[PDB]
Design a protein around this ligand. Structure first.
Ligand SMILES: CCCN1CCCCCc2cccc(c2)C[C@@H]([C@H](O)CNC(C)(C)c2cccc(OC)c2)NC(=O)c2cccc(c2)C1=O
Length: 329
């Protein structure tokens, strides 16, 4: 019981959903498990958009343990992918046979693009289980993950994502099934994200960072890696897209640069086959600009598609927090 698995299903686009049970008796939802945010969100019967009506919507009136929050707060969140709004409440959650009572969460009432048709019209969004820190907790006293640990005192305070039908969130421990070699540890900074100091960044022989304080954030909620907007053109000039097939892409990418993230004594090298994705016979880098609240201009995300596909990540919760990285098996 004390180390347990949450199998993740890869639905398109990317991100990866697991089974969460909410309310009494339990209603099932398939949220994404997001280290890049903190709030729990659940799509509800309050959302009357077609994008909500098409999924399994949580019905708070069917939950005996649901309590609408006393403070009637409307939360608006602008993600990089779209916007969600709704109100706040409390309920009992079940994750992987573990109970988490009196958990604050957002009840989705609305979903939109940030500008007509939006991402939610394409995907099957049912919510977010944020695994970030209290600095982006919009309502309530305690983040989900800290609450689960509080109410489950024999769980070790850690979780890890193994990406790629064999993706799984492992809570309380790790498995040698998922990684090779050693795990190196970096201290977490600030109060919002699984954020670490970045000392330098090279694209092949070119140093492109760092002269100010800079940071990497480990974000399972985003497929892509990122750079700050000022370095958008930097990256696009040094790493071109190019024609490729399934048959020749290894040869085409032999000429591409190694991207080196320098975290002090630890250097993570992303080889071309680890950061270039093949879509429509084009090799394109899995990098884009994305606004990071509270870390504009100096944050670099490491996402799921490039980074976690190749590197097993362990997230150790301070009881100071640490991130562990090792090569995926
Ligand atoms: C292959 C492309 C997939 N894709 C675009 C669709 C994503 C659909 C699922 C979804 C919907 C809502 C939210 C999320 C996921 C999670 C967030 C994640 O929490 C972002 N974390 C950061 C730190 C960047 C952040 C930004 C803004 C607010 C914030 O609050 C603390 C945190 N993902 C995204 O904002 C996002 C952005 C661009 C592309 C994609 C996802 C993406 O990979």
């Amino acid at each position: 019981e004390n180390i347990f698995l949450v199998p993740l299903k890869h639905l398109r686009d990317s991100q990866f959903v697991g089974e969460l049970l909410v309310g009494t008796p339990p209603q099932t939802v398939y949220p994404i498990f997001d280290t890049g945010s903190t709030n729990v969100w659940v799509v509800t019967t309050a959302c009357e958009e077609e994008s909500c009506k098409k999924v399994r919507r949580y019905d708070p009136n069917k939950s005996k343990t649901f309590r609408r929050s006393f403070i009637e707060k409307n939360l608006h969140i602008v993600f990089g992918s779209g916007s969600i709004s709704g109100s706040v409440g409390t309920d009992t959650f079940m994750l992987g046979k573990h109970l988490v009572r009196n958990q604050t969460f957002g009840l989705v009432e609305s979903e939109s693009n940030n500008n007509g048709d939006n991402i939610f019209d394409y995907i099957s969004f049912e919510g977010i289980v944020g695994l970030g820190f209290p600095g982006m907790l919009s309502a309530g006293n305690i983040p989900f993950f800290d609450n689960l640990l509080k109410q489950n005192p024999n769980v070790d305070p850690q979780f890890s994502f193994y990406i790629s039908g064999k993706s799984t969130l492992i809570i309380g421990g790790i498995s040698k099934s998922f990684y090779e070699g050693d795990i190196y540890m970096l201290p977490v900074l600030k109060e919002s994200y699984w954020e670490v100091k970045l000392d330098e960044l090279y694209i092949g022989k070119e140093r492109i960072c760092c002269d100010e304080e800079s940071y990497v954030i480990f974000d399972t909620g985003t497929s892509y890696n990122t750079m700050p907007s000022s370095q958008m053109k930097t990256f696009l000039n040094l790493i071109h897209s190019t024609a490729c097939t399934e048959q020749n892409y290894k040869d085409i990418l032999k000429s591409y640069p190694i991207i080196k993230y320098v975290f002090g004594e630890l250097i993570i090298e992303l080889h071309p086959e680890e950061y270039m994705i093949l879509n429509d016979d084009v090799c394109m880098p899995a990098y884009m600009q994305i606004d990071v609240p509270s870390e504009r201009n100096h944050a670099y995300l490491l996402g799921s598609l490039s980074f976690m596909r190749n590197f097993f990540t362990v997230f150790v919760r301070g009881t100071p927090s640490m991130v562990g990285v090792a090569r995926a098996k």
